Structure formats: structure tokens, C-alpha cells
């Protein structure tokens, strides 16, 4: 379920369907806190958007 006002341009290129990037090759290896901050912390900007 998604909000009615979700950006349509999101669907025109490959993306994570959850609405926020979580590709782990971008995060430093074995850095659990950085990885969880990237995945869940919504006070930090999403990568690639």
C-alpha cells in the first residue's frame, strides 16, 4: 500500500520497491550501525533519491 501522491518517476527506473535504498555494497563492510542507519533512519537522506 502506497500513498496516492507517490512520485511516478520512481517507477520509471529500477528501484527498491520499499521506497528507500538498501543496497549494502554502498555501506562500509561489517559496519552494522551505519548499515541500519542507512536502511531505517528517516532523519538521514535516502541514497540515490
Amino acid at each position: 500500500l502506497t500513498p496516492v501522491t507517490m512520485d511516478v518517476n520512481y517507477f520509471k527506473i529500477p528501484n527498491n520497491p520499499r521506497g528507500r535504498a538498501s543496497c549494502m555494497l554502498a555501506v562500509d563492510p561489517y559496519d552494522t550501525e551505519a548499515a541500519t542507519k542507512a536502511i531505517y533512519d528517516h532523519r538521514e537522506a535516502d541514497a540515490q533519491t
Binding site: 511516478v8 517507477f11 520509471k12 527506473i13 529500477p14
Partner: protein, 48 residues
């Protein structure tokens, strides 16, 4: 992304078009097409 559209008219426009039509997304006022990222459906499955 996979080829999808909100109106049947844009689907008909895609089906009439030439090669490479499936890859281009475009929008009417409140209707849109989303183009497939790789030419799977148009060629790669059926050309054999």
C-alpha cells in the same frame, strides 16, 4: 520496471508502434505509460 499503462489507448499506441516503442514512457494529463527497462517482452522472448 515492467510495461504498464493506466489507459487502454496508450497500450494500443504502444502495440501499433515500431521497434523500441516499449522502452519509452510518456504521460497524458492524468494517464501515463511506464516503459520496460530491457527489451524483454518486445523482442527477446519472441524473436528466438
Amino acid at each position: 520496471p515492467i510495461l504498464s499503462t493506466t489507459t487502454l489507448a496508450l497500450m494500443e499506441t504502444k502495440l501499433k508502434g515500431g521497434a523500441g516503442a516499449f522502452a519509452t514512457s510518456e504521460t497524458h494529463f492524468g494517464n501515463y505509460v511506464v516503459g520496460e527497462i530491457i527489451p524483454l517482452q518486445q523482442s527477446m522472448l519472441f524473436n528466438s
